[PDB]
Amino acid sequence: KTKEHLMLAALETFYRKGIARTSLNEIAQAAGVTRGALYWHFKNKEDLFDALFQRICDDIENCIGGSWTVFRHTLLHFFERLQSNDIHYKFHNILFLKCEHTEQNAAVIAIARKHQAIWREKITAVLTEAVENQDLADDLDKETAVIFIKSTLDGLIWRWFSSGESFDLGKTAPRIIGIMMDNLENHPCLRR
Amino acid sequence: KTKEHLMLAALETFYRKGIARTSLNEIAQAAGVTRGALYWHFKNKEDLFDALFQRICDDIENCIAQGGSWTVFRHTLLHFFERLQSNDIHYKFHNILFLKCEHTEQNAAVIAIARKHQAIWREKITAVLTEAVENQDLADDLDKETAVIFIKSTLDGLIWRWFSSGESFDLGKTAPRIIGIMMDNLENHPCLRRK
Numbered sequence: 136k137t138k139e140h141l142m143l144a145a146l147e148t149f150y151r152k153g154i155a156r157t158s159l160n161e162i163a164q165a166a167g168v169t170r171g172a173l174y175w176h177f178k179n180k181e182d183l184f185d186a187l188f189q190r191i192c193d194d195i196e197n198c199i200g201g202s203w204t205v206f207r208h209t210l211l212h213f214f215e216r217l218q219s220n221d222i223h224y225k226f227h228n229i230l231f232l233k234c235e236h237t238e239q240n241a242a243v244i245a246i247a248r249k250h251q252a253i254w255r256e257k258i259t260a261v262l263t264e265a266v267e268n269q270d271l272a273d274d275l276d277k278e279t280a281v282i283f284i285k286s287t288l289d290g291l292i293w294r295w296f297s298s299g300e301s302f303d304l305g306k307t308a309p310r311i312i313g314i315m316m317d318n319l320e321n322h323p324c325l326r327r
Numbered sequence: 328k329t330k331e332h333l334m335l336a337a338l339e340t341f342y343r344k345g346i347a348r349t350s351l352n353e354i355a356q357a358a359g360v361t362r363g364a365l366y367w368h369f370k371n372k373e374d375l376f377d378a379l380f381q382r383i384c385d386d387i388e389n390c391i392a393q394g395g396s397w398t399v400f401r402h403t404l405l406h407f408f409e410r411l412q413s414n415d416i417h418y419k420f421h422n423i424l425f426l427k428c429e430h431t432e433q434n435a436a437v438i439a440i441a442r443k444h445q446a447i448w449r450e451k452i453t454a455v456l457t458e459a460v461e462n463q464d465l466a467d468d469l470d471k472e473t474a475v476i477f478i479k480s481t482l483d484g485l486i487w488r489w490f491s492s493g494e495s496f497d498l499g500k501t502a503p504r505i506i507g508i509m510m511d512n513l514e515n516h517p518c519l520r521r522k
């Protein structure tokens with residue numbers, strides 16, 4: 136509804152000036168409703184940030200040969216959406232570059248920690264399927280596999296945002312993912 | 328003397344407050360000097376920042392101890408993530424560099440310094456990579472530019488996740504197994520080769 140109209144304002148405002156440096160007052164202006172108006176939908180910056188983190192995870196879910204083989208396909212669909220989808224870009228930008236771990240952003244990082252943790256639970260289930268489906272190894276270490284993908288894939292993201300889009304993400308990302316997949320399958324520093 | 332006294336005052340404050348909401352003044356009422364004794368030593372923030380970033384690189388490059396060539400990069404890698412745990416200054420610094428340094432137009436001043444140090448790395452990596460290909464450790468067709476991205480992304484990604492996760496996992500046990508996977512990759516994997 137008009138909610139999404141109020142959100143794309145906060146998303147946009149988080150993106151021009153960062154989260155801690157943003158005020159509800161300001162967000163209310165971007166979508167041109169009254170500070171009393173948006174309070175009806177969100178009570179503070181954090182609800183809006185929460186609503187935003189949501190709307191990204193819904194896209195990713197709603198973008199899905201084998202099961203394992205499909206996984207990669209979502210992983211690559213994810214990295215392009217980062218580039219061509221206007222919001223996936225701006226959000227992860229704000230998530231990675233404008234969310235400083237201060238007190239003034241204390242409640243907001245809590246919100247984000249929840250979501251990246253549901254992502255981890257959602258990573259475990261995937262690898263769980265691929266072990267039973269014969270795609271992966273009876274022996275795969277899982278706890279260390281989580282760190283590996285998040286380390287590998289977040290780290291490509293941060294590298295790119297903190298380097299001002301200094302390389303050609305679409306060319307690089309499949310290769311890093313290809314090498315990560317080759318690793319989850321074969322390499323043994325990933326075995327229990 | 329009081330040159331170093333301010334240097335940690337900046338580090339503590341930057342840590343307990345993030346870079347941007349830290350005034351040159353605050354760093355002094357923490358150090359015990361006045362604004363003049365501050366300014367005498369430092370022109371502005373970005374240069375107290377410049378000065379810490381160097382000291383980390385200094386500590387880092389001043390630890391090269393011994394074998395081989397490529398066999399040493401591995402050593403200063405494992406030696407890097409160890410310091411990130413045991414060395415209060417190196418921990419507080421990348422805790423700032425990775426978390427409390429937001430990409431706004433105020434920090435814009437100091438993001439240049441950061442970029443500047445971060446690009447020296449890129450060439451000192453591309454250097455290590457070159458001396459490994461010569462010394463026949465890596466292959467000749469090693470797309471050395473993609474190696475550069477690969478390496479930092481992998482290792483920055485390790486650092487970032489660990490930091491941002493709230494240090495939820497044992498970097499002692501993870502890092503060697505991470506570096507190991509990355510090392511064997513650079514040596515052996517065919518998606519890091521040009522033609």
Ligand SMILES: C#C[C@]1(O)CC[C@H]2[C@@H]3CCc4cc(O)ccc4[C@H]3CC[C@@]21C
Binds near residue numbers: 195206209251289
């Ligand atoms: C958030 C986050 C990340 O650490 C960076 C990109 C994220 C994956 C993108 C696509 C995807 C697909 C799935 O089937 C399951 C999870 C994910 C994301 C969560 C973890 C990733 C690597």
Ligand SMILES: C#C[C@]1(O)CC[C@H]2[C@@H]3CCc4cc(O)ccc4[C@H]3CC[C@@]21C
Binds near residue numbers: 403452
């Ligand atoms: C800072 C930083 C990083 O992005 C994470 C770890 C860093 C390496 C540490 C040791 C090292 C040794 C060298 O001979 C040359 C470069 C480096 C650093 C490069 C930057 C890294 C990957």
